């Protein structure tokens, strides 16, 4: 039997990962009948052959391939180097060539001037000696039938697909550079070749991570959709019957919105919720029964909030559109009770984003009405292995750059009404800009934005430059702010993560009390930030919290029982001499024993900086004093930490003049 999954499979590591269990297939006996087939080389040959041909020819060739019938290529030297390989060691010559040319290959004479060997070599062609001989320009449909029929196939080019490629001659002759199957074979790239070939249902084409497997499966569903064999995970389970971090199992829940407000059951809305991690659902004990997501004052129950912030946005089931819930308790619609029905897919994603390359600060961009103080209070109370994940002591609020100025920016843009001709009061301005529907007019926003842009370009940007430079000097921090061009106009070093909450912000604006000015002014100001920013498609907020929280749970499952001394580590700057030993924390690491004993001998002595220590010790208990460190050369890459260890992202610099220190590793 043949089954096709949406993952890169190998014969080696895919069983140690537990890949079918990671899709949800229950094969718990481990009767080792599911033999694997490595597909690294066919994915790489797919990568190489999408250079040369059309993807239509490529995929429609690759589909009709019996993966059970073993075959292998053997590519050749070029036509005027193959005779040179036949000249030395004349014993390795097939019996097909010519008795007139064999006698002329096998002799000892140098054949410098060729009077008839020239003719015998020019009239020679490879096509009458080696029978397949695919070509260089073969229209690669026929490659697959050539490999299905035979088992050794001769070729003269590199861009082939389907099997491994063995060399005919030794390596100095070129100018271009069996398997155990036990009847339940699984591995990607489906086949229409034989009955008993199956394709795994479950995960959508929309949510496949490799994008070449996703391109392939999009084509194999856009044609051939009637003749496939889609089977569920449970049908696969019935047919059967260096631990990595940053790879979570992930599902989507299928809840709905219900009221019991009159003592009667009544279903109102229909929702789905994408990419929630499995470990958090195992933590919270989430099951099918009726849940309530409000507690005692209208605020969400601090686990539903973590669930919604942890994943991406919602989606309606009837309209297939994006959905944003009402945070306010005032209904055109509210959600008081829900009921969770089922889980739909079980793929895996890389939690680590592509943009994260070096150890540098993180700049998050949110709109105004995001749940800032509440999400900070929730992430404050997490401490996995003795270390706090995201402390409050080095996270930067959005208005912290605005409150340090002496005309105190919000108070400065309260005074915008005097420049406008006919408003001459703040309450009259907030009445005039709006419609009395709270969607504003575009022309009032245009006039106020022309009045607002010199306040945000001149009187904000150099103060922001000084502030973010000071915050980069005193450690590696995480800066919440608004309107991402606030991070683009002011030259901000570090990562940039445009984010978006899954809730409606603009009603969240006017619920809060004792904020700055009237709430209508806060909402107008929020609209001005939103008009100010960009046109870039941001993200959802879920990726950053998945990165913050979900890798530490796998490390808690892994090394929750070993010793802190031999499974903890610490890295930072180190100055040799002693005057009135010096060490500043830079990053802390939790890892098992073998990973740290691999970490010790890496070349941590490449990077250097300038280290400045002042003498203002602070409220913390051990004898450590605040300091400053400014990196000079290159930045620390994350591969030089690991893929396997789990480190803290952001921290402070706490231990006078400059010192010119170099960083090193320390552990027990």
């Amino acid at each position: 039997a043949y089954i096709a999954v949406p993952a890169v499979v190998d014969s080696r590591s895919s069983e140690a990962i537990g890949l079918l269990e990671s899709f949800g297939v229950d094969a718990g006996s481990d009767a080792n009948d599911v033999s694997y087939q490595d597909h690294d080389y066919v994915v790489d040959q797919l990568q190489y052959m999408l250079d040369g041909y059309e993807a239509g020819d490529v995929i429609d060739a690759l589909v009709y391939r019996n993966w059970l019938h073993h075959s292998v290529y053997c590519l050749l030297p070029p036509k005027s180097q193959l005779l040179e390989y036949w000249k030395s060691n004349p014993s390795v010559i097939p019996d097909n060539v010519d008795r007139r040319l064999r006698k002329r290959l096998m002799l000892k004479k140098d054949l410098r001037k060729d009077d008839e060997y020239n003719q015998l070599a020019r009239a020679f062609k490879i096509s009458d000696v080696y029978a397949p001989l695919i070509s260089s320009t073969t229209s690669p449909m026929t490659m697959i039938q050539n490999l299905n029929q035979g088992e050794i196939v001769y070729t003269t080019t590199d861009r082939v697909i389907g099997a491994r490629v063995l060399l005919y001659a030794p390596r100095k002759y070129y100018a271009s550079t069996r398997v155990p199957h036990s009847r339940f074979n699984v591995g990607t790239f489906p086949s229409i070749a034989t009955p008993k070939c199956s394709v795994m249902s479950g995960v959508d084409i929309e949510s496949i991570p490799n994008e070449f497997i996703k391109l392939f499966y999009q084509r194999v569903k856009s044609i051939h959709a009637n003749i496939l064999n889609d089977i569920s995970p449970q049908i696969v389970s019935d047919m059967i019957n260096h631990v990595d971090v940053y790879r979570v199992d992930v599902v989507n829940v299928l809840f709905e919105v219900v009221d019991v407000a009159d003592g009667l059951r009544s279903v109102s809305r229909k929702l789905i919720m994408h990419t929630v991690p499995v470990c958090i659902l195992e933590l919270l004990g989430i099951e099918i029964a009726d849940y309530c997501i409000r507690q005692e004052d209208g605020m969400f129950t601090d686990w539903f909030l973590l669930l919604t912030m942890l994943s991406d946005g919602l989606t309606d089931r009837r309209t297939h559109c994006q959905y944003l819930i009402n945070p306010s308790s005032m209904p055109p619609d509210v959600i008081l009770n829900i009921s969770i029905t089922g889980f739909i897919n079980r793929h895996t994603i890389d939690v680590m984003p592509d943009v994260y390359d070096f150890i540098k600060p993180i700049g998050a961009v949110l709109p105004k009405g995001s749940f800032k103080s509440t999400i900070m209070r929730v992430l404050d109370s997490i401490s996995v292995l003795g270390v706090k994940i995201m402390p409050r002591a080095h996270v930067v609020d959005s208005d912290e750059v605005g409150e340090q100025m002496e005309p105190t920016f919000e108070h400065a843009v309260m005074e915008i009404y005097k420049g406008i001709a006919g408003v001459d009061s703040l309450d009259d301005l907030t009445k005039w800009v709006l419609n009395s529907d709270l969607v504003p007019h575009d022309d009032r926003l245009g006039q106020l934005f022309q009045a607002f842009l010199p306040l945000a370009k001149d009187l904000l940007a150099p103060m922001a430059r000084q502030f973010y430079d000071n915050s980069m000097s005193e450690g590696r921090l995480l800066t919440f702010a608004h309107a991402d061009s606030e991070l683009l106009n002011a030259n901000y070093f570090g990562h940039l993560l445009r984010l978006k909450i899954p809730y409606i912000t603009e009603v969240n604006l006017m619920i809060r009390k004792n904020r700055e000015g009237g709430e209508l002014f806060q909402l107008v100001l929020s609209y001005l930030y939103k008009m100010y920013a960009t046109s870039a498609q941001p993200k959802w907020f879920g990726s950053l919290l998945r990165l913050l929280i979900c890798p530490w749970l796998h490390m808690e499952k892994l090394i929750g029982e070993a010793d802190p001394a031999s499974t903890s580590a610490e890295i930072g700057w180190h100055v040799p001499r002693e005057q009135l030993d010096g060490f500043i924390p830079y990053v802390s690491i939790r890892a098992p024993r073998l990973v740290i004993e691999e970490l010790m001998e890496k070349n941590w002595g490449q990077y250097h900086a300038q280290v400045i220590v002042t003498d203002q010790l602070v409220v913390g208990e051990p004898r450590r004093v605040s300091a400053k460190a400014v990196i000079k050369g290159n930045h620390l890459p994350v591969k030089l930490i690991s893929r396997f260890a789990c480190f803290t992202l952001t921290s402070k610099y706490e231990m006078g003049a400059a010192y010119n220190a170099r960083l090193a590793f320390r552990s027990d």
Partner: protein
Amino acid sequence: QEYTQSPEIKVPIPQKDWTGPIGEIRILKDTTSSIARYLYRTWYLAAARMAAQPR
């Protein structure tokens, strides 16, 4: 000094005039009141007539 300069756009493209993402590209809408639709038209027709060349 010279790299800290940055343009100020008094009439930006309004946020309703962009569609959703295709990968990481949003499309400017046809029913757009902004002036950028002429730039969009010119660079569209230029890209199509460039890619249609056998050169």
